[PDB]
Symmetry: C4
Subunit: 293 residues, 4 copies
């Protein structure tokens, strides 16, 4: 058998895989930055890896447009000559394959971020609806702020064994919250204190609030903030440009309505129309508009 790409199943499956890609975009960068050295997130990662493998089987058994193509040989060769390479690299279980340092093995799971390409392929499904693209834009904003928080903690953490002698942002965090790093390397803030501070700093830099209790102090932290300021400015010209445009697109019925109403009102003023005829004109405009949009 074979699946039609416009069926109610394949429509729901493509919206379900968007939510599993959003899960991968959150918990893969987090695990690679904060957790290096079954549990619920270890079995949920296994379930989600199994669903991204089931999606390869669905991609071998779904129709496509050349007019629709429905023969399994003409489907399978199209997927092989298309995206199958990226989909298999995003699905090889390197962590279960390898037996070689656990730092590299935990970092190598960042290959799962190729699952973001499954959202870039399918944008013709997701972008069609105004409330869906406005959701995607705010999740692109929150995911970029999260990925930058993982890089900012990777920088701030690597400068402790490559020791800066109390200069970088983690030593300042320890002193500010009353959880100082001891001279032996003991103590210091928790993973919640470090993550919530790293995410607070990257929203503060991207939205340009710059609150000044977290501030970049070593050269790698200053060079990172120059990059976040070049990202955040292009990203405000693009994301919040598009969000304000989509808000105006949803508002376009109201914008057209008031523009034609103001023309009718200014016409009624300019000709000084008597009340019985004025009411007939402005009531007819409201009927004609509320009928045809």
């Amino acid at each position: 058998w074979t699946i039609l790409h416009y069926s109610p199943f394949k429509a729901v499956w493509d919206w379900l895989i968007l939510l599993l890609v959003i899960y991968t975009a959150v918990f893969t960068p987090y695990s690679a930055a904060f957790l290096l050295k079954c549990q619920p997130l270890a079995v949920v990662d296994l379930i989600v890896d199994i669903m991204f493998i089931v999606d390869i089987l669905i991609n071998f058994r779904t129709t496509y447009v050349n007019e629709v193509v429905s023969h399994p040989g003409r489907i399978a060769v199209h997927y092989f000559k298309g995206w199958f390479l990226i989909d298999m690299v995003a699905a090889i279980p390197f962590d279960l394959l390898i037996f070689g340092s656990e730092e590299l093995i935990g970092l190598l799971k960042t290959a799962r971020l190729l699952r973001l390409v499954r959202v870039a392929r399918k944008l013709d499904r997701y972008s069609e609806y105004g409330a869906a693209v406005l959701f995607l834009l705010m999740c692109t904003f929150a995911l970029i702020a999260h990925w930058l928080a993982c890089i900012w903690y990777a920088i701030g953490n690597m400068e402790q064994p490559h020791m800066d002698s109390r200069i970088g942002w983690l030593h300042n965090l320890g002193d500010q919250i009353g959880k100082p790093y001891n001279s032996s390397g003991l103590g210091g803030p928790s993973i919640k204190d470090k993550y919530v501070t790293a995410l607070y700093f990257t929203f503060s830099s991207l939205t340009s609030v710059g609150f000044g209790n977290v501030s970049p102090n070593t050269n790698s932290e200053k060079i990172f903030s120059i990059c976040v300021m070049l990202i955040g400015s292009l990203m405000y010209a693009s994301i919040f440009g598009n969000v304000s445009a989509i808000i105006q697109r949803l508002y376009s019925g109201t914008a057209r309505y008031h523009t034609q109403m103001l023309r009718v009102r200014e016409f009624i003023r300019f000709h000084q129309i008597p009340n019985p005829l004025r009411q007939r004109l402005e009531e007819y405009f409201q009927h004609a508009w509320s009928y045809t949009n």
Copy 2:
């Protein structure tokens, strides 16, 4: 008898109830955050509650459009099947009904914020005029900045008995203004010092100035600032998008005028028109424009 919904009375009553909803939106969040443990604001709340009850009686005795409907039975059943439930929940005097802790009784008056729905219903009256919608947008800005100041003080205050050991924003405020909290819990800033600082911080976060004498230090304060940065960015794409668009709408006569004037001027340049004919052309344009707009 019965009231016509377009009458000069019902027009003025709907603008008066907007001002009583703006009073509820200010003094209910303030009393629930800053004042928990007749006076003028106790009797003014009683007068305003009585007017929001009188408005339920007016809503039972006003006509509506199906063509207008004027029979009191067809009015009353329409209000019951419509908004009467929300209007009665917004008008039950819980504080006068109950006899059971005074913290809960003072918090339960936040049900009065359902009166904001009386403004959302009637937007077809209020949004029709450019100076009125520009006022509403600046009051939505100032009321969101005020509601966030009440949440920010609720957070900063709750972390003192759930004691942070001198980390949160109220201990920093006490040290900055020369009114420190003593080790016994005595002293500290006044309600004016705490409110004006909380409102200053939420305008500073929403407008993105981030002045850095008030800055979020505990995890609940940092998680609150991440929310205020996600609000403030969507809200600049929406409120100050609409305010700049309404300013351009009020300016649209001037924008059209200069666009048609520049076309006439560039035409007069391109054909190199002699002075007597040039004056006749550019004076006729000013007459035709100042006549028809």
Copy 3:
């Protein structure tokens, strides 16, 4: 005799009076804030007051449009029934009239700020040219930042005799630049240090940089910053809205050119036009455009 309102004299005089209004808008707020307790600015103020009196005589002897009116009686009665009241209040020499405290006498010269109305009247002359309105918008920005610097110093200075006990912004300035206020009230920063810091703070608040070495600390300073954040946000929706629109208006020839060029290029692509005919099409487009704009 009588002056034609479109003459080369009256055109140059109205541009000269704009520069004397910009001088009044700078040096009147500055003198009222920073200098209270001949010199070049004392004689230049006398020369400029004499020119704003000569302008009243020109306003009695210039034609106006009802068709032009040229009889001196029909001119003089029109100026009396129009703006003469504001022009005389802006020209009464109160400082030379009075003989009663010198604080009030120096403050009373702020009546000269009614000369800003001479710019608001004549906007039909000034707003006609794109480079002139873009200059006016940047001078409205710099003059609002300057007037707010004069209010910010008036607040910060009045809280020293109404003594805050070392809390307000002037005590912090003295400590930061190494010019502390002594306990006797001696020492402290110069008028250059206080003015340049006050103007730096109001550009930092209006443009929303918020650098955090000057920050508002008393309640009057925090309430002032809430006002500067409500001004600066409406003012970015209006001034830098209009500056970006005027930049796009000056760019409109280039925007039209590339829009029609891209249509011609996409047409040439879609029909796959052969090179000799393609060159004839795209050269003809450049000739037709460079001829007619």
Copy 4:
């Protein structure tokens, strides 16, 4: 012989000279600010000066439009009466000519910044392509942020021998990174620490983050920040205005597509079209669009 100005050689040479102008715009301001008192950048400057001299020879031997002109006498006299003066001032090797203080000799090489005029002349080549003008706009942003970093270090450095007594930004930098200036003038930060901090401050001021670990403290630093706030605001109204407009221009196919699709969808809703005819309408729209754009 003579070169056609539209030839594949002259097209590639004008794109190569853009990259050598971007090199001059980086390393000339840097050398004049940071390095005053063969190496790779000394021989690369010699190679690049030789290529800007070869470009004068190409400018004497290239055709131009009056219809094209191809006689070497009518070319050479046009270049002499045009830009040859600026091109020779940008190419006189003052550093190799002179033998008189090395401070002045190193500063005098800033005449090479006249090579930026070779980009301003040729904008009809570079501005034609959307990805090229979006690159130019981000390089104008990064080059203005770099030139301001060179001025900011020139100010901060000149106030050390014109000694401020520990007030300016370089003394604060030395104390913040754990590399203090000693009382003898010994020690202090490296050229990497000073450059990366100066560039971090000017991106922080232009993008308006204002992080508050670097902040202007002397009057020349405050007057510089008032200028960077007047630049950064005009520059956001212009550069990020144009970048957001070019992003919308690249998006214009998608914006047109969804606007016509939404009209077709709302028409199909309003007439309640049966499924077989609906599919024929919305498939025909996709064919017609994907054919003609």
